[PDB]
Design an enzyme around this catalytic site. Structure first.
Site, PDB file in Angstrom:
ATOM      1  N   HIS A 136       0.811  -1.238   0.000  1.00  0.00           N
ATOM      2  CA  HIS A 136       0.000   0.000   0.000  1.00  0.00           C
ATOM      3  C   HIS A 136       0.834   1.273   0.000  1.00  0.00           C
ATOM      4  O   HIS A 136       0.295   2.359   0.237  1.00  0.00           O
ATOM      5  CB  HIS A 136      -0.979   0.025   1.180  1.00  0.00           C
ATOM      6  CG  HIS A 136      -0.326   0.233   2.511  1.00  0.00           C
ATOM      7  ND1 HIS A 136      -0.301  -0.743   3.481  1.00  0.00           N
ATOM      8  CD2 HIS A 136       0.337   1.297   3.030  1.00  0.00           C
ATOM      9  CE1 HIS A 136       0.353  -0.294   4.537  1.00  0.00           C
ATOM     10  NE2 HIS A 136       0.751   0.941   4.288  1.00  0.00           N
ATOM     11  N   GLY A 154       4.611   5.942  12.729  1.00  0.00           N
ATOM     12  CA  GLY A 154       5.170   5.759  11.393  1.00  0.00           C
ATOM     13  C   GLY A 154       5.981   4.479  11.255  1.00  0.00           C
ATOM     14  O   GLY A 154       7.026   4.435  10.581  1.00  0.00           O
ATOM     15  N   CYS A 167       5.133   1.713   9.805  1.00  0.00           N
ATOM     16  CA  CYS A 167       4.671   0.849   8.723  1.00  0.00           C
ATOM     17  C   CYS A 167       5.839   0.282   7.915  1.00  0.00           C
ATOM     18  O   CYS A 167       6.707   1.025   7.446  1.00  0.00           O
ATOM     19  CB  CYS A 167       3.726   1.637   7.821  1.00  0.00           C
ATOM     20  SG  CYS A 167       2.401   0.656   7.140  1.00  0.00           S
TER      21      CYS A 167
END
Lengths: 291, 295
Positions: B39, B138, B140
């Site tokens: 993503h 953050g 990810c």
């Protein structure tokens, strides 16, 4: 979730020091290996070690230092308090930026636990107020904080105490608390909660949106200390209230109002609840950690 | 008895920053390939219902800025495997460890190296919950891993934050854990259970550490304990589980079923003001291998 710092910059420094029948972990920084001086003792010698005398009978080649597959050559040795310092023929290429700090009780750091020079695990812990670490042949393992690529080394493991807790020194070889590198009857003084760490953590739960423990009361510093010491909490000091200042003004809760919350919490309990993820009051997070 | 993470320096040497468009997250750099959640190519808009097949067809190599700290890496090819996006790069990471891509079962534990935009921030030990979520920090694109004899077995990559504060992600071949998708759509974790076999291993760890007060002369049954367990939202205990605990039962002299009696008797009456190894909640994030590995 208590996070320990990334260990890689400390892994690059962990070596194995052997003296006769004794082996342990050392710390290779530039051309010096640091380690506990009692690498030079038999088990016998731990009752009443004379360190000047034991060290005077040693040459550089009595100290075998292996960084992995490679034996390092020791070209000089020197005692500084309870830490040994071996000069070697080869500056460590993996030497991070680093400084030595002496930390004070209540503050946190990560520990790289090793076995015979190979890192085995990392964990996050606090220096207890009685100068011990409730932790986990790791002698010579070091504790550290990393701050923007600079490792501040603050602790080295030396002894294990009768109640299953660890005692050690700073890297200038100076012990934390009243302990010696002697197998005597020394025992940990009464251990107490790091009160300021519970309040910082309580403010963290308000930041992550849980307010159920709050109440309408406030308190005085003196009245708070009087109640909390009956639960074996460390005194809160005017300097603790200040350090918490930025957490206060961020959540709009004044420090003594959170003190009032803690007082009631100790009086009642959780009534089934958890606060952040915990069913007990957590004292191993500092005000610097939460922010 | 402290939870311990594996040392993370072998993984630290593998973290890169991957930015496509305005989206930035963490990537894993092994040999000449950078792995990260697909993503990354997603727009705030497309994240509602994306056609990853389409939006990646429209992307070419120059859309992906990959920085190894103070070095931008040149993408020379892209492809998707399940929900992970794979990026071939100009250079091959010299710090690449010996490694394996592995997929773990609920109740196995592993270490995570949380990173903020390619720079590792910290490391923690955690467990794959029975509802396939991670209670975590953050981040990810951060990975989970276990280390065995200088071999990094990667088992997790972080994709999603779920509304209850838990985390959802995939194995390193792009397959999610649990019934989650990588779209911004209403998704929740099932009711979580306690990892029974890990609680029992942690009780064994207590008798090894010398806290033996919860022990009782009693023995109970696989069947009758499992009924006492369903009623407390615990995972059922199977025979492979009992087999797994045989080592710790041999070492301690307490049979798994007699330790189960101890567990069932503490689920109703509590600790009556005592505690196990300095804790009053039943820790369920230590596997058998974790307790042996530490004792």
């Amino acid at each position: 979730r208590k996070m320990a710092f990334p260990s890689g910059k400390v892994e690059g420094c962990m070596v194995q020091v052997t003296c006769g029948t004794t082996t342990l972990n050392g710390l290779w920084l530039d051309d010096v290996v640091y380690c506990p001086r009692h690498v030079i003792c038999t088990s016998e010698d731990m009752l009443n070690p004379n360190y000047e005398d034991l060290l005077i009978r040693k040459s550089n080649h009595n100290f075998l230092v292996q960084a992995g597959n490679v034996q390092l050559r020791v070209i000089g040795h020197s005692m500084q308090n309870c830490v040994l310092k071996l000069k070697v023929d080869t500056a460590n290429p993996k030497t991070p930026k680093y400084k030595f700090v002496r930390i004070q009780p209540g503050q946190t750091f990560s520990v790289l636990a090793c076995y015979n020079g190979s890192p085995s695990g990392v964990y996050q812990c606090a220096m207890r107020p009685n100068f011990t670490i409730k932790g986990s042949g790791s002698c010579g393992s070091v504790g550290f904080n990393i701050d923007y690529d600079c490792v501040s080394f603050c602790y080295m493991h030396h002894m294990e105490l009768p109640t299953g807790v660890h005692a050690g020194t700073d890297l200038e070889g100076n012990f934390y608390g009243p302990f010696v590198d002697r197998q005597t009857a020394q025992a940990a003084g009464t251990d107490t909660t790091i009160t300021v760490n519970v309040l910082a953590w309580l403010y963290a739960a308000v930041i992550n949106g849980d307010r159920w423990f709050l109440n309408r009361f406030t308190t005085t510093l003196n009245d708070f200390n009087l109640v909390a010491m009956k639960y074996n909490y460390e005194p809160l000091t005017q300097d603790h209230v200040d350090i918490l200042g930025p957490l206060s003004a961020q959540t709009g809760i004044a420090v003594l109002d959170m003190c009032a919350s803690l007082k009631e919490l100790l009086q009642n309990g959780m009534n089934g609840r958890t606060i952040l993820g915990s069913a007990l009051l957590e004292d191993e997070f500092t005000p610097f950690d939460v922010v």
